[PDB]
Amino acid sequence: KELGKTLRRLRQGKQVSISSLADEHLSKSQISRFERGESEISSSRLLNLLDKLNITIDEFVSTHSKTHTHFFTLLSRVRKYYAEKNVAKLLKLLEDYAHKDYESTMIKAILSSIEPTVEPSEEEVTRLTDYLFSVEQWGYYEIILLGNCSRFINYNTLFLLTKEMVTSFAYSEQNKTNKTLVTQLSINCLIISIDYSYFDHSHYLIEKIEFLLRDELNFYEKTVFLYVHGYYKLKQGQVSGKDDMRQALQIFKYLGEDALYYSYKEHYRKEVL
Amino acid sequence: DKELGKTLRRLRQGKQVSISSLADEHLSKSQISRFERGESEISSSRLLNLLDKLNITIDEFVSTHSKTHTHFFTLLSRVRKYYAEKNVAKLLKLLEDYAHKDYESTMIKAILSSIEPTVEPSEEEVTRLTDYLFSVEQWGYYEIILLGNCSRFINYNTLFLLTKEMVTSFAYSEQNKTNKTLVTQLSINCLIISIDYSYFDHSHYLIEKIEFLLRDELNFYEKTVFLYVHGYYKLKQGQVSGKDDMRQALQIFKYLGEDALYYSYKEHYRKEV
């Protein structure tokens, strides 16, 4: 509808003629009618055009519109209403997703942190975990659902799901945005393993987190891991973990991350001191 | 084409979705089948709608399909491999295969120069490259990677002016943020050069842009580098508190076990401070 106009603008900005893009299975008329909005074009031909023009399909669609993934839109709306503490609008979003079981479960799980009246039932959570167990390629969808619902999942199932998510990611194409989320959820499961004294699970998650952080930047996850791993060493007898936690606090302080600094500081004063 | 249908089927299979639930009055279930089998086409908007219905981000599609099926992505993966091995022989065979591709060959020669200084892009090649980058509608991954890898052969004044345009017009995706992160790094790199050449009006402009780019983001690595470089700017303006900023960034590197970064920034600190 308007995809053609986006293609024309980017194509012309690169000074690439339509005649230079045409070949045996892509004519100049097919490109022109698409750019003019007079005809659609096959997805394989668009991907061929974007490849010749060195435009990722992600850059192409995001230039056209921000409305192309309803799940990500739902996450941004929830992110907005949660910051506003807009209870009413979150419950309205819950009514929009009443026919979507997993999404409504996730909305109710997020809603509970600011309104204990709303809570996902155990049958709803079990349906979600059953879905996540049956998934063999963990994607952005699955990772976000687990992370935003982990508070209503028992530790045994949460650790089993985490291990399968990490394993599934290791055999994947290694999407970098998903890697970051998989790393953050593994650290969140590591925290709970240390607090509950499941040091066998803790040692396992530590080795996977180190693997996920290797040859990556991701200084935020490394900073959180420094604190959490030091917390593990403090409960294992090593007093050096106390130095690790203090260094992680200094990192938050030096970078002006006041919210993270004060959030971890009171945790350091409660469970360590 | 046929591989495109294979990608959508395994994506739909991984999400445990049936074809009748994806079908609507725009696309019948039988055509979804024929498309996955490579026996029929679908329009580009139908493909985008299918991915959204499957709750698969366009970034996920890029990493699972475009990464191994587009010219620029496969080129970068070969350059990274041959550069890591210092395989100058495999890099020139690459260049001869991309000799007809102008901007790609310019970048290959610019990267080969760091190991084999007899290879350099001509002044006519750089002018065509900067013409192109000055004239694009938006800065995508392709344009950002070109500037970052060829910046050694661009005079400072053009590099700064190109950096201004890149910051203003880069293709931004909220779900991904890969381009935004690269733009932040290249802006910090241009900031370092502006300080060494004592062009502090350019520096103060880049500082304000980098602070904006780091707002509402994590990116602790870029913030740690920016903390050092901003402290170097402060020191070069008589603000000796910049020394504290530079020492703090070095401590962040040391606490996180980033030895290559710690010693590299330490060496710069011991010389110029």
UniProtKB/TrEMBL annotation, chain B:
Gene3D superfamilies: lambda repressor-like DNA-binding domains. One of its GO terms (molecular function) is DNA binding. Pfam families: HTH_3 (PF01381), Rgg_C (PF21259). It comes from Streptococcus dysgalactiae. This is Transcriptional regulator. Signal peptide: none annotated. InterPro entries: Cro/C1-type_HTH, HTH-type_regulator_Rgg, Lambda_DNA-bd_dom_sf, Transcription_activator_Rgg_C. Residues 8-61 form the HTH cro/C1-type domain. The lineage of its organism: Bacteria, Bacillati, Bacillota, Bacilli, Lactobacillales.
